[PDB]
From TrEMBL, chains A, B, C:
Keywords: ATP-binding, Chaperone, Metal-binding, Nucleotide-binding
Transmembrane segments: none
Source taxon at top rank: Bacteria
GO MF annotations, alphabetized: ATP binding; ATP hydrolysis activity; ATP-dependent protein folding chaperone; identical protein binding; metal ion binding; unfolded protein binding
Residues involved in ADP binding: G79, T80, T81, T82, G381, G382, D467
Protein name listed in UniProt: Thermosome, alpha subunit
Pfam families according to UniProt: Cpn60_TCP1
CDD domains with a match to the protein in the record: chaperonin_type_I_II
Family: Belongs to the TCP-1 chaperonin family.
Residues binding Mg(2+): D78
Signal peptide: none
Amino acid sequence: IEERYQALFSNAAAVKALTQVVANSLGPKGLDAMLVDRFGEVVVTNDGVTILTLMDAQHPAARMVVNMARAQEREVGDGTTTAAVLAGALVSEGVNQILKGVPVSKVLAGMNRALNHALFLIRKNAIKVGSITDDRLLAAAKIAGRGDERVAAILRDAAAMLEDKLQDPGFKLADLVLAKVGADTTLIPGVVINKSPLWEEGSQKLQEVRLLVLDDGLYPEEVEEEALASEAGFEQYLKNQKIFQENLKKLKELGVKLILLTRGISDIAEEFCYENEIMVITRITQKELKRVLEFTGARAAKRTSLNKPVEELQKMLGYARTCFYDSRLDFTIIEGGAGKATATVLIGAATDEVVDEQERIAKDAAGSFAAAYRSGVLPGGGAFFLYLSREVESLKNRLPGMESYGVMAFSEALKVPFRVMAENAGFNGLEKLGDLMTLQVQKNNYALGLDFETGEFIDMIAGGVVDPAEVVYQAVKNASEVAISLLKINTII
Amino acid sequence: IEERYQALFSNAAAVKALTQVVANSLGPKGLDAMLVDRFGEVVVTNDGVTILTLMDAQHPAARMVVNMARAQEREVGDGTTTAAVLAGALVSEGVNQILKGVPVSKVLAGMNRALNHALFLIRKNAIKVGSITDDRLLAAAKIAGRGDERVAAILRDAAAMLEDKLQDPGFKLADLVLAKVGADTTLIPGVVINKSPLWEEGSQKLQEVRLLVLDDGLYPEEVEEEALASEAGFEQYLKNQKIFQENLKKLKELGVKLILLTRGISDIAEEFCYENEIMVITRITQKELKRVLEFTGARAAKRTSLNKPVEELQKMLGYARTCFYDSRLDFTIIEGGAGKATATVLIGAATDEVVDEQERIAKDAAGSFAAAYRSGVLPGGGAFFLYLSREVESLKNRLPGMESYGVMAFSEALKVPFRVMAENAGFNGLEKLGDLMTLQVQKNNYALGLDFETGEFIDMIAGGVVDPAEVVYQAVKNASEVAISLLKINTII
Amino acid sequence: IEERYQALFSNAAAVKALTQVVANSLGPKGLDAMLVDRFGEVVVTNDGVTILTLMDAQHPAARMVVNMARAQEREVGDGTTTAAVLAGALVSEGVNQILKGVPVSKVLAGMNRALNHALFLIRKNAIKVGSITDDRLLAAAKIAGRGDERVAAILRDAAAMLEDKLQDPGFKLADLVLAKVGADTTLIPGVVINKSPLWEEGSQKLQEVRLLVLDDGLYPEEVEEEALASEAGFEQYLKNQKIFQENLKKLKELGVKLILLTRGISDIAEEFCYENEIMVITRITQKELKRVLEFTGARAAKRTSLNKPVEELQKMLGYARTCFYDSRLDFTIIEGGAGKATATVLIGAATDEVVDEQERIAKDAAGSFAAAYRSGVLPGGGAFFLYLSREVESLKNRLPGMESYGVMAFSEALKVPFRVMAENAGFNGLEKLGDLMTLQVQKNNYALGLDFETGEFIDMIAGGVVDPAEVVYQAVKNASEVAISLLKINTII
Ligand SMILES: Nc1ncnc2c1ncn2[C@@H]1O[C@H](COP(=O)(O)OP(=O)(O)NP(=O)(O)O)[C@@H](O)[C@H]1O
Ligand SMILES: Nc1ncnc2c1ncn2[C@@H]1O[C@H](COP(=O)(O)OP(=O)(O)NP(=O)(O)O)[C@@H](O)[C@H]1O
Ligand SMILES: Nc1ncnc2c1ncn2[C@@H]1O[C@H](COP(=O)(O)OP(=O)(O)NP(=O)(O)O)[C@@H](O)[C@H]1O
Ligand SMILES: [Mg+2]
Ligand SMILES: [Mg+2]
Ligand SMILES: [Mg+2]
């Protein structure tokens, strides 16, 4: 039952230890981390929420910041490490002010006012985009993709085929990513079924594919096992074994050349498909189901649906221009669908470790693209944080009293992300920080930032280094929620 | 939770320990290794990915390298030991550069640049093949086959019968290999069922074989057990017990003399076959099924398929010129199929251990054959790597900065496989290295290498010592990818 | 029984771990280290040989480098950390060359030639001093004193009172240092007895002190306890109790006002001294004895010496102008002695920890002063090492063959001390290293070094930053002896 100041200590320390760890991954010069499970498994990543999640972090405070990261990821998908470092800074500063005797009440008030002002400036200064072709969107994607231009171009190009889906606040663009070992990273103008067909004789290409999709399995209508002791029961078994074979005949009459199922397939049916040139894939994902349904313009059927007359069934079929089973990667690719258009961002690499990290990078980039398209952009490099820092310090006195301390803490904490990245890039973090602030004021350009390889100060938006607006809004908001939440803590059980 | 430089050590150390072990297997003068199971089993091999797999690899880094090896094996099937050694070299070199104070970031940048240049040069210089007969294909097969010209001739001859199949990026030539103790290494122009027939009276030869093959078992159409309490149910048990017998008569009328099944056989049928001299094999592999299907031109049937008219059944039969059951080796050989032609590369030896290793060698040779046919060849003996080192060191200058160090590390690392193979062959590795590099430049022949037997420098391509191109590309790509990914690691949990 | 390469590893690693630790203490921006004994004791220091000595370092290699440091300290007293870092560099480089396949023989040869050339250049380029007043001597003292100018001035000033003693290769100037808690650091133109007198009535000052010094105790000539059973024995006891009291009377007649003893004092004598105004100090060090003997011009006596006639005794007395017992610090100070002149460099601080570290600094400075006075000076900052580095790399080919590698290693290792200090000063170590080397060649001034606070390149000798020549000679020589000694190692038991 730790209490008093030795609660606030026990907390703050617990957070520092956490943030220190991911601090090394923040930025373009950030380094990776290697994690192993309690009993032998291994991941390597630069992703923040990943690192923070996989260490089983035992202190409650640490677990809370981890949850904050999770939240940040859920909201936008990037800016996790930023949120962590920022949170840590906020907390440490808050503690510092509190130890010097500043009332918690006041620290929290100042921090809140600061927060609201900050978010205000962030929403206000967001520079919005009109296109999807705008180089600022692709730039956002590149920065989030950690410098991969190929991937950024791929995602822009896919989003282009969508856009409408971006209008729904529930469409995660990264859902389009699909990772496959031994693949080559590329854009597929169709959907992928990541499974081998029921019968394979090597790689295979299909053209003018009329397909039938089932959220069922291709079995006859069943008769409960008990009921088979009852003549009529059995006669029903026979009857709908007959109507079943008739239905398969319907399938051939309609010219079906592909069948996808979410369940299994009868032996009789399997034979029918083999003899009549029909390809089958079983056990498809629900996700896969939805996407192929949309793309091919097919309607989802159950076994009973095959009892429709043939004229009514042709209406449930879908169409794809081509369809290709890759014997080397063991999946199937449907392209040229008669329904909505869509894409699959295929991410390839040699080994599991690498394709995993590349998928994470991909999804980061996708989310940040979408986030940019939805919310506009801002100058990256952490500069806009510095703008926010002086603007927040502006508020130091607009309410006089001890809330000032609180405000200062917030301002000072906003200085930290940048400093870290500069330190990560081998520079004198503090020096570059100060210099850049002075310069920002003197040329009045709050978009001036640091080029981390060359070491020269540049114009960030000019340099193609932009962050999505919502990523910053969300990062600051979440980091703030957790830090303020922790600072109000006085006792532990 | 080890961090900082003392992560980079524990990683690097863990890797050297691994690579050292397989280094002695690299080359034509490389030596073998012996491995034992947790509870009594034994392997002997010169193969890299195998040794690396069977080892107790506990460290995360080592496990990552094993995984890389696995990837290299998946991709091309040869060149694993090379990839391991190269990877290790890259890592140690990188560590050294980082220790003299080069920023990790810069090292990795330089290495990436080097990598890309290397791959470019590798692809550019690939020497293409235009025939399945080219003496360079057989050369590749010989070298990968560790000097065995018998096997190489067999694979050339076998690959020849296909050609149509190699065109599929999913066709593993090595899938043709089959190992049998007490056999003699030979080319079989058919497919083998590695099983004894259901009824054997000693070795037996069949000619003019009309055969029927089933992805089922030869049983009557079943009736669920419960339903038998229901008159109609039983009456149909009877009815399609009669229909089964008449179907067998159909088999006799068609003159079927061989039956292959992936499931079992009813006793009634087994008697039918005994009395009408029809040979039967049960429980065949999926491989065996697909192969015999393609080769005999038969169509796969299920029990229900025997209900067609006799005239219709005659269409799914297949035909083989001859068919021979070997009582000594206890398998069956189908030759002269009316379908596509194919081959079985039979690999024989006295003991389990040896035929296992000879099989590994065979598959390696097949894979390098196919890969040569697909991607061309390059000068082996480790020479082309020296050319690439000489070429990569070039960039040190063409881009200024500290990336140079990184590039140097890459350059210096490509030097290692050769030096290892030379030391393994009992030469002064460093001397031969220097001499050979100097010479390579002076005669401008980027293909001069060391004959590890004679000790004289020869032209490797003229000397018939060639590596498949894709094997080199994949090896460099993979070793690089893993080393770079490990060097970016800064912390371990 | 570790053997082969895994001896050379086990060694090299063991050394790295050691050197890393003291590397942080090297330089003007070096930081301190805290050590605790197996059972609760504590030291804080920047001294190298101290840090290295106090960790109980378990690996044989580590223990050897520690011994090397000890040696360096014995020889000159400064340059310990330099020697350690240099040794480490030499070893790591040597290992690197050896792993690439360079014959140990050759590495060692190259390193030796390099060593001899280096020492040659060091002896050749030593810039000698003529004075003792030369600002280059005081500069040497300041640099060694870690920037304390007060102390440097003190030591120069004392050495001035000696100089003759410096002519003997056996006089350690640092022997003049005396550390006292609660004292004030100052030069005393006399000698100090660090003990309280036999009888104290508070602080006390004596003038015109005629003193008697005894390497004995003031007791009568003894009679063995057995002998006291023998009349004549006892009569001898009486007799030389009588002649003893007479001798004390001689002591008063001669006007003795102070007596120093290395042993004890009789009760009768103690009374005699109390009643006749005579101060006594008992149990003085041998060191203290020698110094006060020299300074006061007294001759050492034993009890029997008091049997001389008075006229002959006056000849054994010594004289001091003044003599002062400080009741606050509890020691005694003799000044204005009629013998040789001498000094006591009194080092004061508040606490044990601090006065200890300050004594270490003092002795460092004293030794480096003396070393400068005896052997001349060189440009510090590690620059002269860089001169030596290019000069050593000069030798790379003057013998062609693989010794070249060895030579290079030596050269490259000489680059390391500087780099470390630059890294310690928060700079980019590698960058500053390279820049400075280029500049050194371009302005041809091999005395150009780095100002570690300002960050600008300056002329070192001009900047007052000089090392004693012998400190460098010794550092390089010793570091080399141990590194070469370790590299010849192939097996461990
Ligand atoms: N080339 C660049 N120049 C300057 N800043 C950059 C550059 N690339 C990325 N950044 C900045 O790096 C930060 C993002 O680093 P990153 O490693 O993604 O942390 P994070 O995105 O906050 N957490 P996460 O991406 O989920 O791992 C942002 O502040 C970017 O502005
Ligand atoms: N006769 C030869 N002369 C010179 N080099 C040869 C000769 N035979 C093979 N090599 C080289 O030896 C290497 C093959 O060694 P090997 O032991 O197969 O390693 P690996 O093939 O890379 N790994 P793995 O085959 O999976 O066990 C290649 O670099 C060949 O170029
Ligand atoms: N102001 C300075 N500017 C430049 N170099 C300096 C300065 N002060 C000291 N040095 C260098 O610092 C080194 C000595 O550092 P130091 O910490 O004494 O290590 P060390 O003397 O080799 N071992 P030790 O002195 O026994 O602890 C020498 O190379 C000096 O040239
Ligand atoms: Mg990011
Ligand atoms: Mg091979
Ligand atoms: Mg010193």
